[PDB]
């Protein structure tokens, strides 16, 4: 990152104004840049072309809340009233000629998260080892976590009450002996700072 510099992460409150920076080196201070958006499971999208004087052209199907502006070697992507669907990696790009030949450089990318979203708490479903697996001397405990928003959960497993929308899951790989030799196991899920639990009982 020296032709183009981007900080690798940024976060903004839901519905606030968002401003991202891509800074050009001195040798390219007046160059025009392109902004791209990369979300999982989709093609990357051309967002806009942004000139040194701050003028720009967008889209694609790029909504009117995206705009650009400039200041010296800095190039800004702004999102007004940023929404959860604007979560993505934003990458800046620049073209040039180096002794006769065309060259293109991409920035390292800025991962943007949208904070302060309304919370929907998770529902947990747990399954004990199947009899088929137990006959092979294995035991996988399953914890399925669904109907929650926004994204992002942490999962901890407990045995005998002590340690050791969107979708998520956790698997605890045990032997059949380890399963049969506890009074209980518990999948504990943390979401936006709050805790939900469900237990399995080898005796049942």
């Amino acid at each position: 990152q020296l032709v183009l510099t981007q900080s690798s992460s940024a976060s903004f409150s839901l519905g606030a104004s968002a401003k991202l920076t891509c800074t050009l080196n001195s040798q390219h201070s007046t160059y025009t840049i392109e902004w791209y958006q990369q979300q999982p499971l989709k093609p990357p999208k051309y967002v806009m072309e942004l000139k040194k004087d701050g003028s720009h052209s967008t889209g694609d199907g790029i909504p009117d809340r995206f705009s650009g502006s400039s200041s010296g070697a800095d190039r800004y992507l702004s999102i007004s009233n940023i929404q959860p669907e604007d979560e993505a990696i934003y990458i800046c790009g620049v073209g040039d000629t180096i002794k006769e030949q065309f060259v293109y450089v991409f920035g390292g990318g800025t991962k943007v998260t949208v904070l302060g979203q309304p919370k929907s708490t998770p529902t947990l479903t747990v399954f004990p080892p199947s009899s088929e697996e137990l006959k092979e001397n294995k035991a996988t405990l399953v914890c399925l976590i669904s109907n929650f928003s926004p994204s992002g959960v942490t999962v901890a497993w407990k045995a005998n009450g002590t340690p050791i929308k969107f979708m998520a899951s956790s698997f605890l790989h045990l032997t059949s002996d380890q399963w049969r030799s506890h009074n209980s196991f518990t999948c504990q899920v943390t979401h936006e700072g709050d805790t939900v639990e469900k237990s399995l009982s080898p005796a049942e």
Partner: protein, 218 residues
């Protein structure tokens, strides 16, 4: 409207060759050039070069001279990238990208094709049914455990796709270099076990297809 659809993920040993495709639609194929862009794990985008879709002449970036071949089937509106003598460092997602008017180089993109270069062996999943023993007026949750497979993906449907309401198929979890996945379905009692419920699991990489009727017990 403009779409570039790339071929599916590849798993290959060092030294081998792979050929991946990018199929275009929604515009005149020979009017815009096609670029290729490499995204290695943990790294940013790197342009590899482009092929002139009219002239057929390719231009390679320095890092990509020698082992990489861009080619076309213009009758099929398809561009191809062939990578030869695969190295560990060729592991990446490879994107095709179409140019635009007034000198835009990367106007439209494909979805990417993951190429893994590894000596890891393709492993089929073991499939287990998740069911209770068969109270009145309660909803029942059934499931299907898909364990220990490589590489991704697996797909899951229920009753061949005809059971879709109440189905959650959860993202795969990597643990010790194999993937595990689960799918669940909530069905009314009393629809089960009076009506049959089957999960169907496919792993195209191992040419495997498993059906599992879910019956009461444990």
């Amino acid at each position: 409207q403009i779409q570039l659809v790339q071929s599916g993920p590849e798993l290959k040993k060092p030294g081998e060759t792979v050929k991946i495709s990018c199929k275009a639609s929604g515009y005149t194929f020979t009017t815009y050039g096609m670029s290729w862009v490499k995204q290695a794990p943990g790294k940013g985008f790197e342009w590899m070069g482009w092929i002139n879709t009219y002239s057929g002449v390719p231009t390679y970036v320095d890092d990509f001279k020698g082992r990489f071949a861009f080619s076309l089937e213009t009758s099929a509106s398809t561009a191809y990238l062939q990578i030869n003598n695969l190295k560990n460092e060729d592991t990446a997602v490879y994107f095709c990208a179409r140019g635009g008017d007034n000198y835009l180089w990367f106007a439209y993109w494909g979805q990417g094709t993951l190429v893994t270069v590894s000596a890891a062996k393709t492993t089929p999943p073991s499939v287990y049914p998740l069911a209770p023993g068969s109270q009145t007026n309660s909803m029942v949750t059934l499931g299907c455990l898909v364990k220990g497979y490589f590489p991704e993906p697996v797909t899951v449907t229920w009753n061949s796709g005809s059971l879709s309401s109440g189905v959650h198929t959860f993202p795969a979890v990597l643990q010790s270099d194999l993937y595990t996945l689960s799918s669940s379905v909530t069905v009314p009692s009393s629809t089960w076990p009076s009506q049959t419920v089957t999960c169907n699991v496919a792993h195209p990489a191992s040419s495997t297809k498993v059906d599992k009727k879910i019956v009461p017990r444990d």
